[PDB]
Design an enzyme around this catalytic site. Structure first.
Site, PDB file in Angstrom:
ATOM      1  N   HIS A 172       0.651  -1.873   0.187  1.00  0.00           N
ATOM      2  CA  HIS A 172       0.464   0.449  -0.172  1.00  0.00           C
ATOM      3  C   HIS A 172       1.137   1.391  -0.315  1.00  0.00           C
ATOM      4  CE1 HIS A 172       0.221   0.342   4.290  1.00  0.00           C
ATOM      5  NE2 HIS A 172      -0.270   1.384   4.006  1.00  0.00           N
ATOM      6  N   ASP A 194      -0.070  -7.348   1.400  1.00  0.00           N
ATOM      7  CA  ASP A 194       0.184  -6.469   1.976  1.00  0.00           C
ATOM      8  C   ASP A 194       2.381  -5.926   2.096  1.00  0.00           C
ATOM      9  OD1 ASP A 194       0.093  -3.088   1.865  1.00  0.00           O
ATOM     10  OD2 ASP A 194      -0.468  -3.242   3.735  1.00  0.00           O
ATOM     11  N   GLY A 246       2.014   6.667   8.855  1.00  0.00           N
ATOM     12  CA  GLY A 246       2.857   6.801   8.597  1.00  0.00           C
ATOM     13  C   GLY A 246       4.699   6.138   8.899  1.00  0.00           C
ATOM     14  N   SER A 253       3.523   2.500   7.756  1.00  0.00           N
ATOM     15  CA  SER A 253       3.042   1.966   6.933  1.00  0.00           C
ATOM     16  C   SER A 253       4.300   1.244   6.502  1.00  0.00           C
ATOM     17  CB  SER A 253       2.168   2.778   6.073  1.00  0.00           C
ATOM     18  OG  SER A 253       0.643   2.808   6.818  1.00  0.00           O
ATOM     19  N   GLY A 254       4.585   0.333   6.331  1.00  0.00           N
ATOM     20  CA  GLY A 254       5.449  -0.091   5.041  1.00  0.00           C
ATOM     21  C   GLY A 254       6.533  -0.287   6.305  1.00  0.00           C
TER      22      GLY A 254
HETATM   23  N1  LIG Z   1      -2.773   1.358  13.417  1.00  0.00           N
HETATM   24  C1  LIG Z   1      -1.648   0.974  13.248  1.00  0.00           C
HETATM   25  N2  LIG Z   1      -1.038  -0.349  13.512  1.00  0.00           N
HETATM   26  C2  LIG Z   1      -1.763   2.006  12.050  1.00  0.00           C
HETATM   27  C3  LIG Z   1      -2.938   2.877  11.243  1.00  0.00           C
HETATM   28  C4  LIG Z   1      -3.426   3.348  10.142  1.00  0.00           C
HETATM   29  C5  LIG Z   1      -1.988   3.313   8.861  1.00  0.00           C
HETATM   30  N3  LIG Z   1      -2.214   3.572   8.433  1.00  0.00           N
HETATM   31  N4  LIG Z   1      -1.515   3.879   7.138  1.00  0.00           N
HETATM   32  N5  LIG Z   1      -1.288   4.537   6.402  1.00  0.00           N
HETATM   33  C6  LIG Z   1      -2.564   5.421   5.969  1.00  0.00           C
HETATM   34  C7  LIG Z   1      -2.357   6.174   4.581  1.00  0.00           C
HETATM   35  C8  LIG Z   1      -2.881   7.284   4.370  1.00  0.00           C
HETATM   36  C9  LIG Z   1      -4.260   7.250   4.752  1.00  0.00           C
HETATM   37  C10 LIG Z   1      -5.031   8.559   4.281  1.00  0.00           C
HETATM   38  N6  LIG Z   1      -5.891   8.508   3.737  1.00  0.00           N
HETATM   39  N7  LIG Z   1      -5.225   9.153   5.033  1.00  0.00           N
HETATM   40  C11 LIG Z   1      -3.849   7.011   6.535  1.00  0.00           C
HETATM   41  C12 LIG Z   1      -3.615   5.634   6.930  1.00  0.00           C
HETATM   42  C13 LIG Z   1      -0.691   2.397   9.449  1.00  0.00           C
HETATM   43  C14 LIG Z   1      -0.381   1.753  10.903  1.00  0.00           C
END
Ligand SMILES: N=C(N)c1ccc(/N=N\Nc2ccc(C(=N)N)cc2)cc1
Ligand SMILES: [Ca+2]
Length: 223
Positions: free
Chosen positions: A40, A84, A175, A177-178
């Site tokens: 993602h 993912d 933020g 993520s990944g």
């Molecule tokens: N709670 C978590 N562990 C966790 C929660 C959210 C997460 N989100 N990642 N990415 C993400 C990317 C874009 C948006 C957006 N369109 N505003 C929101 C979230 C990554 C990890």
């Protein structure tokens, strides 16, 4: 990372920042020329930033290397976030050193209760928004699949695992993520998703890297 702590500069030397003019995702260096991240996180124009601590300041240990190729998992489903995971090949090999180091892939899977290190430059707030400049870390246990699937009914697949704290307060976040979830020296998890962040009974969901080791290895070997 919500409720975490400051890692310390380069204490997580496999942690990379994916940069498209700004940090937008973490990743993990798995060898000199390959990063694994979340599918993602896919986008064009990725620069991988290694040796980062403060992502807004050049501190002297960075290597910035453009992605030459991104490979989203063949079965990545963006609706469900199933699979993912994405590989990113660097245009040139990272120079490996104490601050820029690869993290071992699992040779199997981790178990519920295993403590992991989750790291990233993601949001540090559970309500509202604050983005750290320095890398944040979180120790979190892998949660039982049953608690995971109970927290997210109908959404957890065999390629996902929850880690963190059902009580809330401590989680990865937007933020992050990944980025990596490293347990016993192996990349067991990729920060994938969750519902909000650090909310009660909404633990982080992570891509279950151990399911992908064959694909990672085969993909790297062939690319
Ligand atoms: N709670 C978590 N562990 C966790 C929660 C959210 C997460 N989100 N990642 N990415 C993400 C990317 C874009 C948006 C957006 N369109 N505003 C929101 C979230 C990554 C990890
Ligand atoms: Ca920096």
């Amino acid at each position: 990372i919500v409720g975490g702590y400051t890692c310390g500069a380069n204490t997580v030397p496999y942690q990379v920042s994916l940069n498209s003019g700004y940090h937008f995702c973490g990743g993990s260096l798995i060898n000199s020329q390959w990063v694994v991240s979340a599918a993602h996180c896919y986008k064009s124009g990725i620069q991988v930033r290694l040796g980062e601590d403060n992502i807004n300041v050049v501190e002297g240990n960075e290597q910035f290397i453009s992605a030459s190729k991104s490979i989203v998992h063949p079965s990545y489903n963006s609706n469900t976030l199933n699979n993912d995971i994405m590989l990113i090949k660097l245009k040139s090999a990272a120079s490996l050193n104490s601050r820029v180091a690869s993290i071992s892939l699992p040779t199997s899977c981790a178990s519920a209760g295993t403590q992991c290190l989750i790291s990233g430059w993601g949001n540090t707030k559970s309500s509202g928004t604050s983005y750290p400049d320095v890398l944040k870390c979180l120790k979190a246990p892998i949660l039982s699949d049953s608690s995971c699937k109970s927290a997210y009914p109908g959404q957890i697949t065999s390629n996902m695992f929850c880690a963190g704290y059902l009580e809330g307060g401590k989680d990865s976040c937007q933020g992050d993520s990944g980025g990596p979830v490293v347990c016993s020296g192996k990349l067991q998890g990729i920060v994938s998703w969750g519902s909000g962040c650090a909310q009660k009974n909404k633990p982080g969901v992570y891509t279950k890297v151990c399911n992908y080791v064959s694909w990672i290895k085969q993909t790297i070997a062939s690319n």
